[model samples]
Target: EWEVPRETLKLVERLGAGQFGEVWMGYYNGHTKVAVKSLKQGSMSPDAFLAEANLMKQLQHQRLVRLYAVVTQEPIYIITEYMENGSLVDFLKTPSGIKLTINKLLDMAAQIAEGMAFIEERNYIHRDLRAANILVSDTLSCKIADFGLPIKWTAPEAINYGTFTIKSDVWSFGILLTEIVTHGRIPYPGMTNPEVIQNLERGYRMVRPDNCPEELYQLMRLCWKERPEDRPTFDYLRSVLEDFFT
Candidate 1:
């Protein structure tokens, strides 16, 4: 594990909390800004934390959040580069009211797909792939984060049989794509958790957002196919996105 000396790190302010732990904006060695994710004392064991660290340590991609160090001592912390713009979901809803052009939205989606393609190449499935899990830089570059949580963004088979694979990740990506095009609107907007599950099982899919491109909606539908084998691979999804920008 790449352990960061506690003495050199300074916690600046709390950013937010998630199912895994609380995130804080901090600095390393007095100048380098970083995002620190601290696991709650009783929430995760040292061994489990180390295992996740090992997995994340090897991942290095422009569109993936970089894991810089792990503090394995008392209160475990995972340190990564700070994302100035926070999450994609929040970025999309900023009240200062910046709007994204269609090209900008496509670019964001392409970046996410590229990141997931890298994860797929490593034989890893991002059990949680959603707009909220995506981090954005001040420049609007998107990088996938939050490697842990599963249930909410999972595919139907994942919910019914505890199965998680790249195909399921594709399903989650489809939901994220919808969120991106809709500018952070909730998927299955008015449906409860059970209602969403039941509706999906019954072949009900979310309606396309008003003004969403037909091609983009069609690509999302491809990801939500009932059979896992029918979903396009991340590589294929990335290629389609590439073609969109051409």
Candidate 2:
């Protein structure tokens, strides 16, 4: 049922990257946008393409593009959903991408782990998960789009993609931590940017917790430092939490 005649498919865009034999963003029955892929093979096609599509269709998760069908007729086409966004490997090379935090990248691994988690639960559909194969959508969902693809760190973000971020995550933690501390209250009590900017300009910040001590507040304060350097880089931050927790 999934297999369709070549005439039913239309190539609308060339989205060539990641896999071999360049792919296209295609229209199927003019109903949905699809990716028509070429197998990583020399020739002797068709059967292997079908089997890959077979295996791919069976494995489905939001994290995966998930195979939709195939065009196994002469000049076979492998079909799947079109990832509207480009690959993560290409994404990070840009200036905007240069801003991703190490912890943020860590979250990418966490999501990919879940994707892989689903994969391994059924069996071992072994995968390769570096930044290259990871494709992120407009919604910023990071998934292992490959089903192949570096650690070249003159710097850590330089370790692969680019250098930036970890400290901002150092900042993100402090805010979320305060969320837990407040029980259900919002930050800045009255919360205003025309005000927060004014307030922060005047050193204004969130009000203190009811039962929390200033000692713990000291921990939160450093995490929100005006400069990235003032914050902890996660390794010691955990132990510092231990100091308070213990």
User: Against the true structure, whose TM-score is highest?
Assistant: 1
Model 2 per-residue lDDT tens digits across residues 154-221: 11222234334555444544554443344323455665545655555565546676655676677667
Model 1 over residues 29-128: C-alpha lDDT tens digits? 9988998888888786878866767877788899999988889887898888988888899898885214787788888898999999999999998888
Can you give the TM-score per candidate against the true fold?
Answer: 0.92, 0.53
Residue 127 error, candidate 2, Å: 4.4
Candidate 2, lDDT over the whole model: 0.58
* RMSD of each predicted structure: 2.1, 14.1
Deviation in angstroms for 40 in model 2? 10
